[PDB]
Amino acid sequence: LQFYRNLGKSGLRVSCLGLGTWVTFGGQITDEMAEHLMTLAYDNGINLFDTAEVYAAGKAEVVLGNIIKKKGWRRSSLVITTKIFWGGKAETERGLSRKHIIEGLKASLERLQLEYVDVVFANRPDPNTPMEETVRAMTHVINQGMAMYWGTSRWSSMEIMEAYSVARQFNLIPPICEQAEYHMFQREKVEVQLPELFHKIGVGAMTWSPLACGIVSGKYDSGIPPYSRASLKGYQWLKDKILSEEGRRQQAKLKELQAIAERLGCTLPQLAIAWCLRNEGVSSVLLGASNAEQLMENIGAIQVLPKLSSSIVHEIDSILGNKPYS
Amino acid sequence: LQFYRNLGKSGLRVSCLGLGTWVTFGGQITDEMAEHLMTLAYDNGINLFDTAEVYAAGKAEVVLGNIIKKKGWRRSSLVITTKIFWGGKAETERGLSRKHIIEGLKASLERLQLEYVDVVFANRPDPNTPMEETVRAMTHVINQGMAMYWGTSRWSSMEIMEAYSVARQFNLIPPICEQAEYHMFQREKVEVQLPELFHKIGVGAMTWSPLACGIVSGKYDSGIPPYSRASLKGYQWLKDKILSEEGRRQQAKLKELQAIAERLGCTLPQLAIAWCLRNEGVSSVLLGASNAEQLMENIGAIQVLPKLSSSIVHEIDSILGNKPYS
Amino acid sequence: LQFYRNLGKSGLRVSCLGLGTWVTFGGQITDEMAEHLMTLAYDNGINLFDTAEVYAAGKAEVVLGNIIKKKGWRRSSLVITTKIFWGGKAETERGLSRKHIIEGLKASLERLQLEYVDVVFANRPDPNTPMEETVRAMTHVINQGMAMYWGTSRWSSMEIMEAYSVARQFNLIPPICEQAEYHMFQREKVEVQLPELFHKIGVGAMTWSPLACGIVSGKYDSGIPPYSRASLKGYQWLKDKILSEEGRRQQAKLKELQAIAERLGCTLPQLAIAWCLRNEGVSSVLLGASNAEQLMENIGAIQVLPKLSSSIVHEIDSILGNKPYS
Amino acid sequence: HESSERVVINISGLRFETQLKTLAQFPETLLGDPKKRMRYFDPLRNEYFFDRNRPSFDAILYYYQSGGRLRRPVNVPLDIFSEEIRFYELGEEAMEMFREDEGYEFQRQVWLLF
Ligand SMILES: NC(=O)c1ccc[n+]([C@@H]2O[C@H](COP(=O)([O-])OP(=O)(O)OC[C@H]3O[C@@H](n4cnc5c(N)ncnc54)[C@H](OP(=O)(O)O)[C@@H]3O)[C@@H](O)[C@H]2O)c1
Ligand SMILES: NC(=O)c1ccc[n+]([C@@H]2O[C@H](COP(=O)([O-])OP(=O)(O)OC[C@H]3O[C@@H](n4cnc5c(N)ncnc54)[C@H](OP(=O)(O)O)[C@@H]3O)[C@@H](O)[C@H]2O)c1
Ligand SMILES: NC(=O)c1ccc[n+]([C@@H]2O[C@H](COP(=O)([O-])OP(=O)(O)OC[C@H]3O[C@@H](n4cnc5c(N)ncnc54)[C@H](OP(=O)(O)O)[C@@H]3O)[C@@H](O)[C@H]2O)c1
16 A cells, blocks of 8 residues: 555665666666666656675676666665675675675775665675674764665574674664565565564565566466576576476466466466565565566556455465464 | 853854745845845844755755855854755655755755755654664764754654753764744743753754744735735745634734834834743744845844833733743 | 684684785885785785885885785785884874874875775884773774774783773774784794683784794704895894804704604795694784795695694694793 | 573663573563563663562562572562562462462351351
8 A cells, every 4th residue: 555665663765666686787688678677667666776796796786877877866866775795706805894895885886886875785694704893884884974774684583683782782873674585485584583673673674586586477387488587597596496396386386376366356476576565574575577568567566465355365375385383 | 132142052152033044035035135135134143044955945045055155254154054854756855864864964065055054953853764863864964064063843842852862872962952933823832842951951942933924013904915925826825824713813912012012112023023032942033034124124123122021021921812831 | 724714703804824024025125026926925815915114114015005006906805904103203203192093004005005904003012102092093093994903013912901991991993903923932922812812802813923034944054144134234133143042042943843844745934834823813924035935935834734733733842842831 | 582692671770681591481471472571672772671660670580590489589578579570470380489488059158157
């Protein structure tokens, strides 16, 4: 119902849908296509756009940076996020040390051609860097004007809470967001771990991959279509899990979920995305698209969100049978 | 008696009268008139000048910025304030989040052509942004050299006290001022709520609209004069309250207050302004004027302030009958 | 076994070997030789490079700064350290005051042609400057972006712990490293004093002079070879200790240690360097070299480190007879 | 959940500090159940606040630290300390031990008079 919503218990207002740049920007799709995909999202009210320094070895932030500069959109009207962890072959170019957090974020801002990102994420937990060093570094870049907020990604709820403690301990800035994978076949974290942190310390969730890299779309019940993500170089790992034992088992359950999509007058990608936004602890879902027909179809998941009854939600939890034990 | 006075319990010395820019600058009056009005106020000892990013959609700060640059006045001799809340159509361009407080104040400084404002206000309370985020953002812009002090506007005394708590909690900078409406027909806040905060935490009051947008001047007992504020586009709301049931009731009470003005050898606008400065908790009153004859008349309220006896103050509280129950 | 290792309990990853610039850069060896020595170290995985404002009266940081600029190495791939204490003849140009820490580090960054060093050290304890002033100054340059971390050098464990206390006392940044002399003839500090701080507050040790300025290499059992360090101007102090009473006594013990080198299929410099890295509290050993044959020989000490058995370690502690009483 | 994570409990200004594994020992109590105690959490200070009696909480926290020892302090009234045990919801099996340690138709009608 309500389109925009706060990113956790903070003042940053993001749209419930966001456009990511993994795989697509600077790799799968042309720059002319990326501009068209972003202009559609921006003209439809989406303000949240996600990227990382590891996507396309920096070419994704470059493509994203040129679209923003070309279209001339107001920086105040955009919510740009970036993730820092993998920044080069060298030893000191990876992790969450104060050296790479500052160097990596500065390098991303150069490619993005932006003075600051709205949120800077830790793309994964770094067991080599002490929590105090990471929190001080994240607070430092915020106070230096390179970022407005900072969040975590792939951190356990025990680690997110620790960063909140170290922040309160040394009068620093706690994290406000957590990027966790969340779709119909990955539910243990957002539905069990995170909601306790959303009510306790107010950390919101910005979930990624709502269609399991396109698996939920049902385009794989026959095989691996050409030009799809599974057919791409570097994504043999995805093709393995699709044609594996569990892969065919998931495709069978999508056939039943398809009937729920037709009954609700929508597609299956729209049902899966609307299924993610059904939680109050989910501040936004990051979409992915390689063509304009996919994007504006996935934007239509907002229509399906009111049509989600607890009877339907219970109906889907029976087809999947993966309801996490609370 | 004493012209200049401290802004609350702080070291910033403001004149008891200040010139605002709502309605007039960049809208009702020409830029050549605005320059003349400001030069009169500055040449008469007024150092406090008020504006906001919402007035004339940014044109008020532009006009104000050009007068200061043209006349070549010493920045050290001016006290420039600005208010931040409404900054554009977009979702992330409104409120008191760290994103808009920094972006909105930076944009105001660009239009003002100034490196910093002396005070930055929160034009209204923002129920979407946590208090800790707003206080950190206000402290951040102060430590970054974009502002000297920060205050609140339209906040309840419970919210102002909370910002003071969160400031002391995280070793941040508390607010020093509160802009509240205060005239003969709006008295519940400055005369009851605020004086407790002025003695406890020393938050001063910088009251606005001392003549109820010109109603107290008595120019409406016949009708809506041409070229006045009530006849302006976008101010039908004011014309409604003037010709309403209470509107004629207020005009009747001004007839009695007029006799007090003649008895004191002054006008009615001067009596109403001097009536506001009668409190120690009121650090300054923000004036408004569309011509030079109004301004230098309103400046004459300083003469009426010594002539205010407690017998006269009690006499006015009987005509209004709105003495707030302490 | 494991090449790179954390600098103490911090996130900065340094190689176990580092190339220093004392004596050599800007003094003993030509700039063309210094470039060749550094390119060999960098091409072999060494990222840690050490210098000071006192080495060659600033010419060492200049030579080091030109190599980094010429080769075009990524700043994110380098770990540059500098030490601040001796900065000129004047009275205010020495010590650990806030004046010289800021002025001295700024001057080093100018010669280094770098925006920041990864670590800034206090080259020696300053009994004239209060600990609170030094810690605030070290925290200040870190927060100003002139340095990433700061450490101590030649400080006693009682002083290092005090800096950690004053840091926790005033919410500042504690030190992460300590540069202490450590070779087969100087062992009381790294083997007794420091390991308590490495487990308590996690301060790592970056040891310097692993060959006693070349004494351990065994090139002095006949006399003072030409072009060596002992034959250099300004190093009569070294020539005195070599030909002194204890000097010949140390050369006699090197003859026995030579047999251990041949038994392990390595040289004596390699055995002494690998002997230093045998402690977990030693984060890195700073090498020194005047020719390329010395450097790539000393780099081979990594091969000897696995071949160090506790039987061999006990065998060397018997030849030296200087095992520090724990 | 038994994880050495530290928990700060503030009793009317008196600061208490313990491990989460200590409170998770008794999940049926107030401080032991994450759902019951979250109503008292302060995200600005990372602590749980209670506006209640201060001398009583010494034994309440030690009831978790010792593993079941519930002994009223010598300076806390008996009626006050007993009302604190019911707030923190230590349990009837624990309340009974505290009382033991403290020293504590026609047929039915004719049966009453006699
Ligand atoms: N925090 C992290 O570590 C992390 C990790 C991953 C992603 N992310 C962020 O989250 C975003 C999520 O991306 P995602 O790839 O996971 O998105 P997704 O929704 O899981 O899948 C997107 C992909 O599925 C296919 N697809 C999308 N819409 C479709 C439709 N309507 N019909 C049929 N196929 C469709 C497209 O692939 P093809 O057309 O190529 O088949 C598209 O590239 C990323 O862009 C990134 O910003 C974050
Ligand atoms: N914090 C806030 O939210 C807030 C809100 C409002 C204002 N403010 C600040 O406070 C200032 C107060 O402005 P205000 O409009 O409330 O001032 P006001 O004193 O209430 O009324 C000023 C208006 O009354 C008329 N007027 C002024 N002097 C007169 C005189 N001597 N005789 C007859 N008519 C006279 C003029 O209007 P016409 O000539 O057009 O009739 C003038 O524009 C603003 O400039 C703004 O800076 C702040
Ligand atoms: N914190 C401090 O106060 C402090 C003090 C000193 C040094 N340091 C740092 O630590 C580094 C240590 O330098 P160091 O001079 O002590 O190094 P070292 O290992 O003690 O000796 C290096 C010197 O020994 C000779 N040498 C080196 N390798 C050799 C080999 N394989 N065979 C024969 N001779 C060899 C060379 O001198 P010749 O060829 O000239 O004989 C070379 O200059 C310095 O560069 C400096 O960065 C710090």
